[PDB]
Amino acid sequence: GPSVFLFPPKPKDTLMISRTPEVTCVVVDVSHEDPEVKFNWYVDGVEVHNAKTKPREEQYNSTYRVVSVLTVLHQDWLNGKEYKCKVSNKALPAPIEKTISKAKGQPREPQVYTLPPCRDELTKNQVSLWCLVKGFYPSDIAVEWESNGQPENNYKTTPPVLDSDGSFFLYSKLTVDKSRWQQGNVFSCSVMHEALHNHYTQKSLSL
Amino acid sequence: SVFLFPPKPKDTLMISRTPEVTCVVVDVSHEDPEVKFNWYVDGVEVHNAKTKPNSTYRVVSVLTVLHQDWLNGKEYKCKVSNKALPAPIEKTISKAKGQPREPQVCTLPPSRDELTKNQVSLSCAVKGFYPSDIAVEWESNGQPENNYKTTPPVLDSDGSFFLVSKLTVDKSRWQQGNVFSCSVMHEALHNHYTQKSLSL
Ligand SMILES: *[C@@H]1O[C@H](CO[C@@H]2O[C@@H](C)[C@@H](O)[C@@H](O)[C@@H]2O)[C@@H](O[C@@H]2O[C@H](CO)[C@@H](O[C@@H]3O[C@H](CO[C@@H]4O[C@H](CO)[C@@H](O)[C@H](O)[C@@H]4O[C@@H]4O[C@H](CO)[C@@H](O[C@@H]5O[C@H](CO)[C@H](O)[C@H](O)[C@H]5O)[C@H](O)[C@H]4NC(C)=O)[C@@H](O)[C@H](O[C@@H]4O[C@H](CO)[C@@H](O)[C@H](O)[C@@H]4O[C@@H]4O[C@H](CO)[C@@H](O)[C@H](O)[C@H]4NC(C)=O)[C@@H]3O)[C@H](O)[C@H]2NC(C)=O)[C@H](O)[C@H]1NC(C)=O
Numbered sequence: 001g002p003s004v005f006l007f008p009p010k011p012k013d014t015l016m017i018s019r020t021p022e023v024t025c026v027v028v029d030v031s032h033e034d035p036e037v038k039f040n041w042y043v044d045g046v047e048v049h050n051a052k053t054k055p056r057e058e059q060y061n062s063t064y065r066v067v068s069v070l071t072v073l074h075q076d077w078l079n080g081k082e083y084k085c086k087v088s089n090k091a092l093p094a095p096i097e098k099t100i101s102k103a104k105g106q107p108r109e110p111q112v113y114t115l116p117p118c119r120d121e122l123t124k125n126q127v128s129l130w131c132l133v134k135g136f137y138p139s140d141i142a143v144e145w146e147s148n149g150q151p152e153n154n155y156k157t158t159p160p161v162l163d164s165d166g167s168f169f170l171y172s173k174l175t176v177d178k179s180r181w182q183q184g185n186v187f188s189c190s191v192m193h194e195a196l197h198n199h200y201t202q203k204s205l206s207l
Numbered sequence: 208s209v210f211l212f213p214p215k216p217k218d219t220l221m222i223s224r225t226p227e228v229t230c231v232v233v234d235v236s237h238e239d240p241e242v243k244f245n246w247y248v249d250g251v252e253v254h255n256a257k258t259k260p261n262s263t264y265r266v267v268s269v270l271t272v273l274h275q276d277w278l279n280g281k282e283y284k285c286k287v288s289n290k291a292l293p294a295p296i297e298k299t300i301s302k303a304k305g306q307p308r309e310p311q312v313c314t315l316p317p318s319r320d321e322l323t324k325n326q327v328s329l330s331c332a333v334k335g336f337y338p339s340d341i342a343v344e345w346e347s348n349g350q351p352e353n354n355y356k357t358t359p360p361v362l363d364s365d366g367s368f369f370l371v372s373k374l375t376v377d378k379s380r381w382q383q384g385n386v387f388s389c390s391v392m393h394e395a396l397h398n399h400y401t402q403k404s405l406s407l
């Protein structure tokens with residue numbers, strides 16, 4: 001019989017006024033004999049009528065996959081509203097219902113710290129600046145680097161990791177030329193997270 | 208359905224620990240219950256696989272791999288055959304091919320703003336390694352440490368990897384000049400080991 005899986009919005013999308021956060025309801029193992037899927041969508045129980053449902057798509061394994069997408073207000077998501085996806089299909093004994101919302105824990109401001117390059121990489125002509133971000137919850141977060149107003153380029157970030165007290169931490173690594181460090185420039189680690197004031201905080205470093 | 212798994216890094220890098228794959232077969236019919244295995248290494252056949260002790264049973268099977276075989280990325284041909292299948296189904300496993308690259312290892316002391324908190328966060332940067340198979344741990348005065356978590360390896364723009372491991376200690380302790388130690392194990396190293404250490 002069909003199964004249903006229900007995905008939340010991407011963290012970057014929840015956290016950013018210019019993006020489009022969506023929950024996505026995917027149904028799979030839909031047969032040829034009972035191919036029609038019907039979706040109903042609810043926000044904290046009230047039916048909504050403007051998800052965008054995609055036509056069915058046959059998969060290499062000869063089952064249909066049918067997907068339905070609902071855009072969520074930024075503030076709804078963040079205020080714990082719950083999104084239910086109800087799926088019907090003749091091959092099911094009864095409709096299947098899944099519900100999703102932000103993680104339910106008590107929210108927790110992350111702590112941001114910046115870290116100078118290792119004293120021993122101070123020779124090789126590229127160095128590494130490290131941003132430690134920790135104690136945050138939920139794990140949905142967004143980290144960037146920047147120098148004098150401008151957004152940086154070559155940095156990479158670890159996913160959040162579950163810490164032993166139930167909170168999360170990650171690190172972000174940023175590579176610049178030795179000479180750019182040594183010239184006393186200011187680098188800045190930005191963190192966007194629901195529990196910070198104005199959903200944003202920033203820490204900087206140099207020599 | 209057929210899936211083929213790798214050994215757990217410390218197993219393959221240590222001359223005495225025992226490294227082991229797994230061909231886990233899922234979704235075997237109470238209709239067609241019989242399942243026959245055929246693992247080859249490099250397409251030549253051996254038989255010394257073991258076979259582990261809701262709606263179905265998902266039937267296991269365990270092999271040991273020569274340390275040298277797996278470090279030389281031997282191709283661990285798995286082959287499962289049921290009557291519910293069209294052909295015989297076949298997974299195929301190795302460590303990642305490519306030039307092995309040695310990790311660079313780096314300890315970092317707490318941030319100065321963190322000094323004002325109640326416990327400190329000692330950090331271990333580990334970068335430039337390939338393949339991603341690795342193993343990190345913390346010890347102080349030659350004694351296992353417990354309070355440490357470690358990020359997964361993250362892929363870097365030159366195809367190499369990195370991670371950081373954060374060990375969390377009592378505030379007072381760091382200040383009593385204690386030498387604390389990060390230990391890393393990886394194939395590309397001399398002795399598949401290296402310590403690096405830091406203190407006040
Ligand atoms: C026939 O094919 C079908 C389609 O498969 C394709 O075709 C075949 C031929 C083959 O080629 C496949 O490779 C092809 O993929 C098969 O459907 C698949 O079925 C399985 C189940 O049988 C599904 O498995 C689940 O998958 C998710 C992981 O979700 C996916 O990641 C996978 C793996 O990377 C990826 O392939 C999928 O596409 C999903 O990716 C995510 O999709 C979403 C939405 O599209 C993306 O989010 C959206 O992104 C947009 C951008 O595009 C926007 O940003 C938007 O905002 C956003 O919403 C998302 O980014 C994308 N992510 C990634 C990384 O790609 C697992 O979560 C899921 O959970 C598991 O559930 C198990 C029970 O089944 C359980 O055992 C596990 O614990 C686990 O987790 C639990 O599950 C609970 C409920 O059961 C949860 O409530 C609970 O939280 C959790 N609990 C615990 C304790 O952990 C499960 O693993 C698979 O997704 C299907 N694939 C697709 C593509 O639909 C079909 O099976 C097959 N049929 C037959 C008979 O063979």
Ligand SMILES: *[C@@H]1O[C@H](CO[C@@H]2O[C@@H](C)[C@@H](O)[C@@H](O)[C@@H]2O)[C@@H](O[C@@H]2O[C@H](CO)[C@@H](O[C@@H]3O[C@H](CO)[C@@H](O)[C@H](O[C@@H]4O[C@H](CO)[C@@H](O)[C@H](O)[C@@H]4O[C@@H]4O[C@H](CO)[C@@H](O)[C@H](O)[C@H]4NC(C)=O)[C@@H]3O)[C@H](O)[C@H]2NC(C)=O)[C@H](O)[C@H]1NC(C)=O
Pocket residue numbers: 233234261262263265
């Ligand atoms: C009920 O049984 C469940 C499993 O058996 C099932 O039996 C039937 C009911 C039937 O429906 C059948 O289809 C099922 O097989 C138990 O639930 C859980 O099963 C989990 C799988 O969802 C299993 O997770 C494993 O995680 C371990 C890690 O410790 C891995 O060994 C392993 O690998 C992965 O496979 C998943 C597929 O879900 C994939 O998403 C992962 O990323 C990873 O490999 C990936 O494989 C796919 C190949 O298609 C690729 O797309 C990816 O690239 C690849 N990923 C990467 C990073 O390379 C397992 O999945 C759990 O062990 C198990 N749950 C628990 C809680 O133990 C269930 O336990 C049982 N119920 C009860 C009540 O006991």
